């Protein structure tokens, strides 16, 4: 009924120290005599750490945290200082007991490294071919962190792995690829980074910034314009990144007639007593360039 | 240290599986066990605590320890049958030589 209590795996961080738990659970009425404790690495020929009941400790860095001469050996927990990449592997914790014999457990040591997560926006213009608009970097992680994108827009990710600054670590860089459009600028895309060192997955959000020429539109006219009508107003609906730096009003036949007066981004229509047929043009200027929008105006 | 060996015998045969070793210091403990689906312990010997037979009291002719700091850890099997066939492992704990292991695969033909 004498059992050895220890976990199957133990997480330890690179550079720091880790305690390998290993305890011998003996029922209250049972009598046992632990002659010695043994720590061994899978396929290393010789022993790593030994604690004999009369001789004491012997190591190859390593220290028995609870073992002591005089007291009955039960806690074979060992502290491993300065965790290296080569320290990751399988370890055996053996108890040489009497009359129960040899009892052991196999513990896996997992060498980890907490990665540094950073998200960035990629400022792009308008082109046919798909180009990365977002960037997610998970620098110096062990094992390489899992990066996924949470977006309803539907963009294929370009994920690549590169060696880290420290030995045994990997930096994961993921680019969110999508065809740039006007109905995408301002929308958010969330990056989900997953790693064993994190209790909860780190969520990083980036707001897409697409540079597009003015998407100029003209609304107000509805053909129902009678002679000697009320002072109507036409608005030049424009959406551009960066914002418009000017609003110019004109026609195909030259400048604005006396009834049409420019009010910046708006245009006031004064009452007319004679029939007119003029096609108004709204010119919206931006850093990228200028775009036009035409509308036929008929009064009868 | 870590050796595997095949032993062939017939019905009604006698065999002595011996684990011979030498220490610079002293022998800590030694055991005999049959390994199948589980590790079924047969006998344990300690120089201070003595012997321990997992089964019944008449185990006098089952194991022997012959002691220059040299030893012979023997398991005796007499008038064997097909049920005796299997893998028998011996574990020798030495100081400061460590743990020695020898597996005997006994086959009854
Ligand atoms: C760690 O080790 C466990 C036990 O390994 C067993 O004992 C060693 C000495 C060999 O005989 C081996 O063939 C046995 O399986 C494994 O169950 C476990 O998968 C190992 N961990 C990893 C991640 O490989
Ligand atoms: C995936 O992306 C590759 C470009 O990789 C990037 O290169 C420079 C510009 C850095 O930003 C770096 O961090 C990136 O890894 C393309 O060469 C490759 O064609 C793309 N994959 C596919 C299938 O198109
Ligand atoms: C991301 O989400 C929001 C997006 O709002 C827009 O922000 C910039 C890019 C302009 O286009 C502006 O007109 C929009 O309102 C932001 O309010 C929010 O603060 C951003 N959060 C982070 C963490 O970047
Ligand atoms: C065994 O050792 C661990 C680690 O040093 C300690 O936390 C724990 O109290 C001990 N367990 C028992 C049951 O003695
Ligand atoms: C629009 O305005 C810009 C800046 O004043 C000018 O260069 C461009 O020629 C204008 N376009 C039209 C058709 O008036
Ligand atoms: C060894 O085996 C033989 C039979 O093969 C037997 O006669 C002998 O007594 C055994 N040795 C010991 C020490 O008992």
- Ligand 1 site, CB within 6 A: A 42, 90, 106, 108
Name chain A contacts of B98, Cβ cutoff 8 Å: 38, 46-47, 50
Containing domain of residue B37, as a range?
Answer: 1-109
Chain centroid, CA A14 distance in Å: 23
User: Alpha-carbon distance A46 to A111, whole Å?
Assistant: 23
* Residues contacting residue A132 through CB under 8 Å, at least 6 positions apart: A122, A124, A158, A175, A176, A177
Whether the CB of A83 is below 8 Å from some CB of chain B: the reply is no
For A145, A293, B46, the CA distances from B65, given in Å and listed in that order, are 57, 106, 10
Buried b (16+ CB within 10 A) or exposed e, A37-53: bbbbbeeeeebbbbbbb
Nearest residue to A101 via CA among B55, B21, B4, B46: B46
User: A78: CA distance to ligand 1 center in Å?
Assistant: 20
Taking CA A273 as the corner, what is the angle to CA A267 and CA A276, rounded to the nearest 5 degrees?
A: 60
**In chain B, whose CA is at the least distance from the CA of A104?**
B39
Pairing outcome for strands B50-53 and B39-46: antiparallel
Name chain B contacts of A35, Cβ cutoff 8 Å: 28-29, 46, 93
Pairing outcome for strands B98-108 and B2-9: parallel
Six-digit token string for A207:
């707001």
Q: Domains in chain B: how many in total?
A: 1
Which of A33, A46, A101 is nearest residue B98 as measured by Cβ atoms?
Answer: A46
Which of A55, A98, A102 is nearest residue B49 as measured by Cβ atoms?
Answer: A98
**In chain B, whose CA is at the least distance from the CA of A43?**
B2
Q: Which of residues 92-151 of A touch B (CB under 8 A)?
A: 94, 96, 98-102
Whether the CB of A50 is below 8 Å from some CB of chain B: the reply is yes
Are B39 and A28 spatial neighbours (Cβ–Cβ below 8 Å)? no
Angular region, A287: left φ>0, alpha ψ -120 to 50, beta rest:
alpha
Cβ distance A47 to B1 less than 8 Å, yes or no, reads no
- Across chain A, which distance is largest between two alpha carbons, in Å? 120
Nearest residue to A96 via CA among B85, B25, B8, B100: B100
Buried b (16+ CB within 10 A) or exposed e, B69-98: eebebbbebeebeeebeeebbbbbbbbebb
User: Alpha-carbon distance B99 to A47, whole Å?
Assistant: 9
User: A4: CA distance to ligand 4 center in Å?
Assistant: 13
- DSSP per position, chain B: -EEEEEEEE-TT--EEEEEEEE-SSEEEEEEEEEESSSEEEEEEEETTTEEEESS-S--TTTEEEE---EEEEEEEE-S--TTT-EEEEEEEEEETTEEEEEEEEEEE-
Angular region, A260: left φ>0, alpha ψ -120 to 50, beta rest:
beta
User: Alpha-carbon distance A22 to A49, whole Å?
Assistant: 13
Taking CA B59 as the corner, what is the angle to CA B58 and CA B65, rounded to the nearest 5 degrees?
A: 145
Kindly state which CATH superfamily the domain A115-211 is placed in: Immunoglobulins (2.60.40.10)
Place of tokens 């704990």: B93
User: Alpha-carbon distance A38 to B37, whole Å?
Assistant: 24
Q: Which residues in chain B are immediately followed by a break of C to N over 2.5 Å? A: 67
User: Alpha-carbon distance B70 to A281, whole Å?
Assistant: 110
Name chain B contacts of A55, Cβ cutoff 8 Å: 95-96
User: Alpha-carbon distance A53 to B78, whole Å?
Assistant: 37
For this experimental structure, what is the resolution in angstroms?
2.9
* Top-level class of domain A1-114: mainly beta
- Ligand 4 site, CB within 6 A: A 19, 21, 23, 65-66, 75, 77
Pairing outcome for strands A9-13 and A101-112: parallel
Fold of domain A212-300: Immunoglobulin-like (2.60.40)
User: Alpha-carbon distance A32 to A92, whole Å?
Assistant: 21
* Bridge partners, residue A81, by sequence: none
Cβ distance A102 to B31 less than 8 Å, yes or no, reads yes
CA dihedral angle for residue B76, residue A33, residue B57, residue B104, rounded to 10 degrees: -20
Taking CA A162 as the corner, what is the angle to CA A161 and CA A164, rounded to the nearest 5 degrees?
A: 125
Q: Which atom number of ligand 6 is nearest to the Cα of residue B64? A: 13
Name chain B contacts of A99, Cβ cutoff 8 Å: 44, 49, 52
* A115-211 and A212-300: identical CATH topology: yes
For A219, A261, A293, B41, B76, the CA distances from A266, given in Å and listed in that order, are 10, 9, 14, 97, 110
Six-digit token string for A10:
């133990």
Q: Which atom number of ligand 3 is nearest to the Cα of residue A186? A: 11
Which of B33, B49, B93 is nearest residue A36 as measured by Cβ atoms?
Answer: B93
For A20, A173, A176, the CA distances from A161, given in Å and listed in that order, are 31, 6, 15
With helix as H, strand as E and coil as C, how does chain A read? Answer: CCEEECCCEEEEECCCCEEECCEEECCCCCCCEEEEEEEEECCCCCCCEEEECCCEEEECCEEECCCCCCCCCCECCEEECCCCHHHCEEEEEEEEEECCEEEEEEEEEEEEECCEEEEEECCECCCCCCEEEEEEEEEEEECCCEEEEECCCCCCEEEEEEECCCCCCEEEEEEEEECCCHHHCCCEEEEEEECCCCCCCEEEEEECCECECCCCEEECCCCCCCCCCCCEEEEEECCCECCCCEEEEEECCECCCCCEEEECCEEEECCCCCCEEEEEEEEEECCCCEEEEEEEEEEC
Give the count of Cβ contacts less than 8 A between chain A and B.
45
User: Alpha-carbon distance A234 to A221, whole Å?
Assistant: 7
Q: How many CA atoms within 13 Å lie on the side-chain side of A280?
A: 26
Kindly state if the Cβ of A173 falls inside 6 Å of ligand 2.
Answer: yes
Query: Which long-range contacts link A52-59 to residues 24+ away (Cβ below 8 Å)?
Result: A52/B28, A52/B95, A55/B95, A55/B96, A58/B96
Are A133 and A178 spatial neighbours (Cβ–Cβ below 8 Å)? yes
Question: Is the preceding omega at residue A143 within 30 degrees of 0, hence cis?
Answer: yes
> Can you give the residue ranges of every domain in chain A?
1-114, 115-211, 212-300
A201 min Cα distance to partner chain B (Å): 42
Nearest residue to A252 via CA among A271, A231, A277: A277
């Amino acid at each position: 009924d004498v059992v050895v209590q220890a976990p199957t795996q133990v997480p330890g961080f690179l550079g720091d120290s880790v305690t390998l738990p290993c305890y011998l659970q003996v029922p209250n009425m049972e009598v046992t005599h632990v002659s010695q404790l043994t720590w061994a690495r899978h396929g290393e020929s010789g022993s790593m750490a030994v604690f004999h009941q009369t001789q004491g400790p012997s190591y190859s860095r390593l220290e028995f945290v609870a073992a002591r001469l005089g007291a009955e050996l039960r806690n074979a927990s060992l502290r491993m200082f300065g965790l290296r990449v080569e320290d990751e592997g399988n370890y055996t914790c053996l108890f040489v007991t009497f009359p129960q014999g040899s009892r052991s457990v196999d513990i896996w040591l997992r060498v980890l490294a907490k990665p540094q997560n950073t998200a960035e926006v990629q400022k792009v213009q308008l082109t046919g071919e798909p180009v990365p608009m977002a960037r997610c970097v998970s620098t110096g992680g062990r094992p390489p962190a899992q990066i996924t994108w949470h977006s309803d827009l539907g963009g294929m990710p370009n994920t690549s792995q590169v060696p880290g600054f420290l030995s045994g670590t990997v930096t994961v860089t993921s680019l969110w690829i999508l065809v740039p459009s006007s109905q995408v600028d301002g929308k958010n895309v969330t990056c989900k980074v997953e790693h064993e060192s994190f209790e909860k997955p780190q969520l990083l959000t980036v707001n897409l910034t697409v540079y597009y020429p003015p998407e100029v539109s003209i609304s107000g006219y509805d053909n129902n314009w009678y002679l000697g009508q009320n002072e109507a107003t036409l608005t030049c609906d424009a959406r551009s990144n960066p914002e418009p730096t000017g609003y110019n009003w004109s026609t195909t036949m030259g400048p604005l007639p006396p009834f049409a007066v420019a009010q910046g981004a708006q245009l006031l229509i004064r009452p007319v007593d004679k029939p007119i047929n003029t096609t108004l043009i709204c010119n919206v200027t931006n850093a990228l360039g200028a775009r036009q929008a035409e509308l036929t105006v008929q009064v009868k | 240290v870590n050796t595997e060996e095949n032993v062939y015998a017939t019905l009604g045969s006698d065999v002595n599986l011996t684990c011979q070793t030498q220490t610079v210091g002293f022998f800590v403990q030694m055991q005999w066990s049959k390994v199948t689906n589980k590790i079924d312990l047969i006998a344990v010997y300690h120089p201070q605590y003595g012997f321990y037979c997992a089964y019944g009291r008449p185990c006098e002719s089952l194991v022997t320890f012959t002691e220059e700091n040299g030893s012979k850890w023997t398991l005796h099997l007499r008038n064997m049958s097909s049920s005796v066939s299997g893998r028998y492992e011996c574990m020798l704990v030495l100081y400061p030589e460590g743990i020695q292991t020898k597996i005997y695969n006994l086959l009854i033909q």
